[PDB]
Design a binder for this molecule. Structure first.
Ligand SMILES: [Cl-]
Lengths: 45, 52
């Protein structure tokens, strides 16, 4: 498992929610993706 | 998010699903995360019929 790269991506995606200015529909899917990724890689932000 | 980066990210995740040594639970979560990112960022890698 490439844990550090996955963790970097998880941090980046969290930031997209807070500073990324995405659309509502993209935000809904992204929120789900982040929850799933934290389970997949065993690391949270 | 830049489309090029989104694509690279999803490709990395697909590779982790096949080679990351994740638990069964983690693999399922990863498969769903892929669906979600494809929808969120408007690019496809795995293209599952399951993606909503
Ligand atoms: Cl496959």
């Amino acid at each position: 498992m490439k844990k550090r790269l996955a963790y970097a991506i998880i941090q980046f995606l969290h930031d997209q929610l807070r500073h990324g200015g995405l659309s509502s529909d993209a935000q809904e899917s992204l929120e789900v993706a982040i929850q799933c990724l934290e389970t997949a890689f065993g690391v949270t932000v």
